[PDB]
Amino acid sequence: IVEGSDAEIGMSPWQVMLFRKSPQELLCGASLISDRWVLTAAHCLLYPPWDKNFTENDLLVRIGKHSRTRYERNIEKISMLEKIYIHPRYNWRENLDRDIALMKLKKPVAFSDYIHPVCLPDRETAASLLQAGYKGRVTGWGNLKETGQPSVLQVVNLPIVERPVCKDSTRIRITDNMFCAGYKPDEGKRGDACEGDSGGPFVMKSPFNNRWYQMGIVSWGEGCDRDGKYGFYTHVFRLKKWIQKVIDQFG
Amino acid sequence: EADCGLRPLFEKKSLEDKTERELLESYI
Amino acid sequence: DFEEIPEEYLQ
Ligand SMILES: COc1ccc(S(=O)(=O)N[C@@H](CC(=O)NCc2ccc(C#N)cc2)C(=O)N2CCC[C@H]2C(=O)NCc2cc(Cl)ccc2CN)cc1Cl
Ligand SMILES: *[C@@H]1O[C@H](CO)[C@@H](O)[C@H](O)[C@H]1NC(C)=O
Ligand code: NA
Numbered sequence: 001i002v003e004g005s006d007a008e009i010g011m012s013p014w015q016v017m018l019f020r021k022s023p024q025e026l027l028c029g030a031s032l033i034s035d036r037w038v039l040t041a042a043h044c045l046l047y048p049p050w051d052k053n054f055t056e057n058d059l060l061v062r063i064g065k066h067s068r069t070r071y072e073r074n075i076e077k078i079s080m081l082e083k084i085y086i087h088p089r090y091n092w093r094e095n096l097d098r099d100i101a102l103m104k105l106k107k108p109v110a111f112s113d114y115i116h117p118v119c120l121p122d123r124e125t126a127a128s129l130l131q132a133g134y135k136g137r138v139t140g141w142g143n144l145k146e147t148g149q150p151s152v153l154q155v156v157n158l159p160i161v162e163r164p165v166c167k168d169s170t171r172i173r174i175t176d177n178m179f180c181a182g183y184k185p186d187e188g189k190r191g192d193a194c195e196g197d198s199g200g201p202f203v204m205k206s207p208f209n210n211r212w213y214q215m216g217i218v219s220w221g222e223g224c225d226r227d228g229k230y231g232f233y234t235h236v237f238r239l240k241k242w243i244q245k246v247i248d249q250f251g
Numbered sequence: 252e253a254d255c256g257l258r259p260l261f262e263k264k265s266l267e268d269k270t271e272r273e274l275l276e277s278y279i
Numbered sequence: 280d281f282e283e284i285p286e287e288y289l290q
């Protein structure tokens with residue numbers, strides 16, 4: 001996260017760290033959506049241009065974390081993966097269209113003060129909140145700058161951007177399955193996700209029921225926090241039919 | 252689940268985090 | 280660099 005701040009304890013209890021077994025290292029962010037299911041970006045697991053194609057046994061998920069590097073004894077819980085599901089129409093070739101994946105844990109995780117699931121939006125909440133100017137929150141342990149790394153979880157609040165502005169910021173073909181967020185050059189304030197924040201949640205707090213909803217997944221950006229560029233997020237609601245199909249069929 | 256999106260250390264205790272008001276204020 | 284995690288999780 002670029003130009004963010006340290007998270008408060010328990011501020012994002014759905015935050016998950018995707019952790020490589022060997023060598024032991026951060027792979028990505030992710031989020032907890034139930035006691036058995038974790039949501040992330042497909043490119044965290046499958047990205048052929050970089051020779052990335054992880055299998056279940058390659059990975060761990062660490063839940064309830066705050067420190068990036070410490071083993072947080074008595075607080076974090078570490079889980080093995082039963083199965084990975086990647087969206088069948090995930091477009092890693094062109095533009096990361098449908099950049100979404102689910103991971104089923106081998107065993108349910110116990111909720112605590114530091115571990116708790118985020119809500120997924122229904123159609124109405126998506127329609128109400130996914131509007132230009134409305135702000136969401138992005139969290140992660142990724143790089144602090146494009147070109148170092150944080151001691152603890154970072155947080156930044158960012159406004160959703162008008163679709164035509166998103167489109168005009170890039171040569172990449174944008175789709176309805178993405179939205180973009182970030183400040184404009186003229187707005188002064190700044191901030192963005194960066195490398196290592198991939199797969200983490202873009203969340204919004206509903207003013208209707210005071211619950212946090214995951215509206216986006218950290219997907220891509222041309223660099224990090226560049227003027228005139230924006231961060232692009234997987235549109236969780238647009239892909240929810242797939243999410244529900246996977247959970248209903250395999251869980 | 253029934254309890255999704257309500258944080259034990261915040262919503263469940265009626266405590267606010269330091270910047271959530273920024274989000275609320277943007278929801279015009 | 281990361282603090283080592285309990286071996287039980289690597290098994
Ligand atoms: C297959 O689809 C893509 C393939 C590449 C790129 S990209 O080159 O623009 N960004 C890529 C890689 C990158 O940043 N190259 C360094 C770079 C520096 C300057 C410019 C300019 N002008 C362009 C690229 C990226 O974000 N990728 C490639 C695969 C994973 C994803 C990623 O890093 N996501 C994390 C992320 C997420 C968000 Cl929301 C914001 C920033 C970032 C970090 N760039 C976008 C798409 Cl949609
Ligand atoms: C990635 O890994 C799987 C299984 O190891 C393999 O079958 C597949 O062909 C690879 N490439 C993909 C899914 O694009
Ligand atoms: Na364009």
Ligand code: NA
Pocket residue numbers: 182183192225226227228229230
């Ligand atoms: Na920018």
